[PDB]
């Protein structure tokens, strides 16, 4: 399953001018575009090397879309102050994420479009793409308004059409890197805790995509209950890294193995401290 997703953030800054608006585009988990209203030259730009086929008109068009949206988000933040009777004095945030997940049949699997005010659900487009869920009484005003205006239909048309067409195109264009699989470079380290115990750490670096399985075992038995894990983290170069650790008795390290599995392998890799 693949997706095209856009993320918008507007942050008000009283006494400092208009809100800053930032829009970021994602194909699957890869950031591929960015617009920042605060940039010396506020323009939508590629954040990836494989978007070079698009013309100047492409980025010009996106830029104007985001500029128009920035204006809307400013209005949204002002309106929210009224709805919630809040002061013009404080900073507030308004966020949107929307996009399309496509099934192997090449058609929309799930379209979504959600909004948040100050980091909490405000209003969202339901899965049927024909109705809204309002999170509170303020958002119920918006719901009434968007229902009267027939907003849902236009969003559904986008999610089912342009969004899907775009994903198809970008996936095709970024194919060589988006769909690649770089296997992890994995190894085991050994760190004494005390006289009785030591830490065995199973490392995996430089892998893509980010999904990976690291499983400590004791004489063949799955020990995925006593492992210490870190959340998979970005290497900074587009790859990911992660480790899984187990505390074992000193002198019994040889009884344990780390099983590493990832798309870029073929079959599991079995590692051990020796």
């Amino acid at each position: 399953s693949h997706s095209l997703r856009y993320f918008y953030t507007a942050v008000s800054r009283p006494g400092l001018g208009e809100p800053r608006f930032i829009a970021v585009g994602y194909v699957d988990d890869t950031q591929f575009t960015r617009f920042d209203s605060d940039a010396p030259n506020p323009r939508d730009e590629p954040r990836v090397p494989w978007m070079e086929q698009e013309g100047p008109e492409y980025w010009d068009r996106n830029t104007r879309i985001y500029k128009d949206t920035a204006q809307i988000f400013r209005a949204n933040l002002n309106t929210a102050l009224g709805y919630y009777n809040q002061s013009e004095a404080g900073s507030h945030t308004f966020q949107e994420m929307y996009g399309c997940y496509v099934g192997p049949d090449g058609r929309l699997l799930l379209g979504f479009m959600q909004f948040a005010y100050d980091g909490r659900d405000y209003i969202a487009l339901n899965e049927d793409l024909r109705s809204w869920t309002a999170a509170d009484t303020a958002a119920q005003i918006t719901k009434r308004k968007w229902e009267a205006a027939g907003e849902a239909e236009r969003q559904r048309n986008y999610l089912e059409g342009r969004c899907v067409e775009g994903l198809r195109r970008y996936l095709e264009n970024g194919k060589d890197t988006l769909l690649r699989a770089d296997p992890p470079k994995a190894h085991v380290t050994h760190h004494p805790i005390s006289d009785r115990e030591v830490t065995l750490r199973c490392w995996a670096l430089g892998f893509y995509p980010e999904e990976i399985s690291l499983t400590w075992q004791h004489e063949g038995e799955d020990q995925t209950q006593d492992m210490e894990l870190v959340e998979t983290r970005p290497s900074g170069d587009g790859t990911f890294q992660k480790w899984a650790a187990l505390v074992v008795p000193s002198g019994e390290e040889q009884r344990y193995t780390c099983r590493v599995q990832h798309e870029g392998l073929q079959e599991p890799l079995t590692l051990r401290w020796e």
Binding site: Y6, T69, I72, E96, Y98, M113, Y158
Partner: peptide, 9 residues
């Protein structure tokens, strides 16, 4: 390509 901005809230 992004969608055109949704109606104001």
């Amino acid at each position: 390509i992004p969608a055109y901005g949704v109606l104001t809230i």
